[PDB]
Ligand SMILES: Cc1cc2nc3c(=O)[nH]c(=O)nc-3n(C[C@H](O)[C@H](O)[C@H](O)COP(=O)(O)OP(=O)(O)OC[C@H]3O[C@@H](n4cnc5c(N)ncnc54)[C@H](O)[C@@H]3O)c2cc1C
């Protein structure tokens with residue numbers, strides 16, 4: 001593809017939502033272009049995916065490869081770049097390096113960016129005991145001692161599921177209280193194998209070939225503890241693309257996510273959204289639901305383009 | 309499993325939505341039981357599925373096999389039977405036709421819908437040999453071929469619209485003087501130079517040799533009988549939601565007879581969730597991917613409900 005080319009739909013992103021939307025957009029015979037920065041999106045940080053029905057215990061890297069093969073069967077052009085602006089003048093989609101493209105409709109599958117922690121040992125033990133998704137990996141830590149870092153809904157829900165599989169969960173958070181919804185806190189509080197480690201931070205993640213310990217510091221007392229753990233789940237949340245939405249005149253909900261209706265329509269006619277950047281099923285971040293929302297957004301774009 | 313046993317969640321159905329809910333329910337460590345009549349649900353009548361991302365060109369029968377394999381990896385017990393009633397006591401009592409009754413803290417309904425039957429001569433004979441019940445699924449296979457779409461609602465009109473982008477010509481056949489589809493769909497399709505409306509008409513027969521070759525059509529006004537050469541026939545006459553089952557079990561339905569759910573797949577009865585084609589969510593869009601995703605959402609709502617309880 002070249003700058004200035006016009007498409008029926010431009011899909012922004014290259015994660016599950018974008019792949020799901022591209023598959024349906026191409027099969028609807030919409031001239032489709034996908035522009036995304038990172039192939040696979042959040043899946044680039046995942047290990048094995050075993051909750052996408054029908055792809056049993058698949059390495060996330062292989063899931064990305066087969067999702068790409070599926071849309072390439074339909075010859076969907078994929079441009080690796082960052083979309084900076086979406087202007088209505090038809091739409092003109094401006095990219096950082098590869099020019100401006102035109103479209104009758106746009107589907108945003110831009111996801112959310114993981115809030116970074118960055119503690120010593122985190123890079124060293126990537127894929128070696130550290131996980132960024134408790135609901136995905138909890139089944140892999142049956143009868144192991146684990147730590148969850150975080151204090152919102154993501155971390156409390158993570159501690160709840162890990163409490164079911166694991167020996168014990170140390171739930172570590174830097175504040176004096178959790179910010180999670182009260183029922184999540186109360187539910188986890190009643191688990192005898194979950195220990196709250198409030199007012200604390202992880203100073204270091206240590207191990208040999210795999211994670212073996214976390215050094216924890218209490219910010220109020222200075223007390224330092226070394227906990228022996230086999231897994232560390234970093235669950236500090238994700239940042240929605242509020243700035244991108246605001247910059248491009250797209251409404252966001254009061255949580256900062258792109259507001260969509262049932263049919264994945266944003267506040268801008270002709271612009272749809274799918275996946276975890278949206279307000280739909282907020283808080284539930286899964287491959288299957290992003291792929292499904294992509295199918296719905298493609299169907300809404302199809303109806304919009306054909307009726308236009 | 310044995311009668312009287314209690315589960316955290318009982319999933320009714322064995323189609324995409326129930327498999328999707330069972331996979332998540334098992335992964336949340338919910339004590340799960342699946343009771344369903346037909347493994348695969350509507351997939352038992354599908355051909356090749358090429359719109360479930362990541363399972364490229366999978367035969368529907370192979371998709372049922374791998375969906376089953378996936379939940380059995382989690383040792384989810386599956387009972388092949390019909391659920392006759394869901395009694396709301398404190399807890400639910402799910403009554404089956406042949407396996408006794410079971411108790412549950414929550415229930416997920418993935419009971420789907422039933423395809424309305426046309427029943428024209430040649431239809432059952434040419435199943436899988438030129439007849440399709442899903443335009444969105446099969447349209448890509450009819451590029452540069454001639455097809456007929458039978459029906460008059462939204463699915464037939466949108467089916468014709470999609471097929472017009474692949475096929476050389478599309479005959480849209482319906483027995484009434486007008487279509488009952490949203491006017492916008494009718495107006496949009498009418499402009500296609502390759503779509504021909506064949507209103508006030510019925511198909512008398514679907515004919516072929518090894519595969520579909522013709523449809524015999526009768527015009528109900530003029531009485532004229534004519535044969536149209538076609539490579540494919542897409543029957544798009546709708547589905548029947550389980551309104552009776554919903555009413556029987558005290559579950560509210562939407563204005564179209566589907567199980568009313570909110571965003572999180574909650575029905576009007578606390579502790580009862582629903583997923584897939586039987587629900588009011590994304591009405592009209594009936595796909596494997598969306599049923600499997602709604603199953604995951606219903607399982608998560610059941611998980612939250614049970615853990616809170
Ligand atoms: C470590 C980890 C493991 C996980 N494991 C599982 C699992 O096993 N099962 C499961 O169901 N879920 C899992 N998840 C959750 C799941 O991966 C996400 O819910 C899902 O990937 C969301 O898909 P998405 O397409 O909406 O967004 P993302 O995956 O966030 O992808 C967004 C895409 O948009 C691109 N993008 C963003 N902004 C721009 C821009 N301006 N221009 C161009 N491109 C842009 C990104 O580069 C990326 O390609 C996991 C998440 C993490 C972090």
Ligand SMILES: Cc1cc2nc3c(=O)[nH]c(=O)nc-3n(C[C@H](O)[C@H](O)[C@H](O)COP(=O)(O)OP(=O)(O)OC[C@H]3O[C@@H](n4cnc5c(N)ncnc54)[C@H](O)[C@@H]3O)c2cc1C
Nearest residue numbers: 321322323324325345346349350391420445584585594596
């Ligand atoms: C011919 C055909 C081809 C299709 N092709 C495609 C395609 O290529 N791609 C695509 O994405 N979609 C396709 N679809 C649509 C897709 O199959 C459906 O959207 C999907 O199967 C719906 O799944 P579900 O689980 O909600 O319902 P269903 O598949 O309808 O399953 C409902 C389940 O509930 C069971 N059940 C119902 N009542 C009871 C009861 N009282 N007790 C116990 N069990 C009960 C049924 O036996 C069944 O197991 C096709 C549909 C048809 C009819």
